[PDB]
Amino acid sequence: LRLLDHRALVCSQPGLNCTVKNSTCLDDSWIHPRNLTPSSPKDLQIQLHFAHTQQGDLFPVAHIEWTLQTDASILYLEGAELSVLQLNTNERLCVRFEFLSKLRHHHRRWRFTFSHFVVDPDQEYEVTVHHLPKPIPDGDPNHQSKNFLVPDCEHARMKVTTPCMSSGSLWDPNITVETLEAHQLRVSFTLWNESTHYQILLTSFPHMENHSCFEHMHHIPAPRPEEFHQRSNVTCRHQVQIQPFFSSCLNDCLRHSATVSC
């Protein structure tokens, strides 16, 4: 989990004076509870957006938008805490909205947007907004939570993001499997611009059977920089698959397979 940039995060809207702060996900209100607390947020909504940084890199971003309620508890609202929790690895990224001015007018509905949380592809997070001050012990929740599922590089727009390109989401192996005599197989494929080794896996299944009677591994060494994209070749159902070893996916990349019948 990371923020898009260390730049100034604009968070003040006309009529409000807000401030964005780094947040160790703990809170002073949690340490020191306050008697009078605001209520839960309303209409939490997390969408997927894409942001270009000044360096030309495009990243997926969790665009969060929420709103307040019209009850008078707005008079005791000193801020919000926006937290993103990665579900598999319990990583937390928190950002604190601190309200400098007191929110007393309900003339217009209040809407808060934050679109600087970088999100990894094919991932699942929990996005929560906690209205600070946090409640006293054995009090009402006053926070809102949602689950944000972010698709893989097979998604049409996500195939062009920097994370997906780093793992070779645009890789086109251009496989050619030709059956040469003496039971030989010649397999030719293209190389992506990364100095890492490749795995060729050959499996010889029977014509109609969910088993194998022959397996073979061959290791393609790391190609030289002067051979970044140049094609390379290696000399009854024969299934041959390339597994790359990119630095993004160490051994869990997207494989590319080919099958030859009897």
């Binding site: 989990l1 990371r2 160790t24 996900c25 703990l26 949690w30 340490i31 929790l85 579900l87 598999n88 690895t89 319990n90 990583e91 937390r92 990894d120 592809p121 094919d122 991932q123 699942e124 929990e126 929560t128 409640p135 012990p137 009090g139 929740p141 939570s145 994370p163 780093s166 793992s167 969910n210 993004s248 996916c249 160490l250 869990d252």
Partner: protein
């Protein structure tokens, strides 16, 4: 010691979060699991997402559940900060609790 001082400015030493290196393995694993959220308003971290192994046997290459191998959770002991009731002399307590992080496929004894 019985009572120690804790500075709650949690130092984020997990700095190398910029690389994108992982994914969700609760579906592609030989021992898949469901995600159960554990929420405690009086505890930090409040929400901990634990693993509950989906089956009692793993998944073979055919996709059918094979019962010769066991899906066992990978348990971890993690420190938790808990808010104490007002009658206690110390407002906070550091405890150790067991959480299931994932599930792995093992050969039975």
């Amino acid at each position: 010691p019985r009572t120690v001082m804790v500075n709650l400015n949690i130092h984020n030493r997990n700095t190398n979060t910029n690389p994108k290196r992982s994914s969700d393995y609760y579906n592609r694993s030989t021992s898949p699991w469901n995600l159960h959220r554990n929420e405690d308003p009086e505890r930090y971290p409040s929400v901990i997402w634990e693993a509950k192994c989906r089956h009692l046997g793993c998944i073979n290459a055919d996709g059918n559940v094979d019962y010769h191998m066991n899906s066992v959770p990978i348990q971890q002991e993690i420190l938790v900060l808990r808010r104490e009731p007002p009658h206690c002399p110390n407002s906070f307590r550091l405890e150790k609790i067991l959480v299931s992080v994932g599930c792995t496929c093992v050969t039975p004894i």
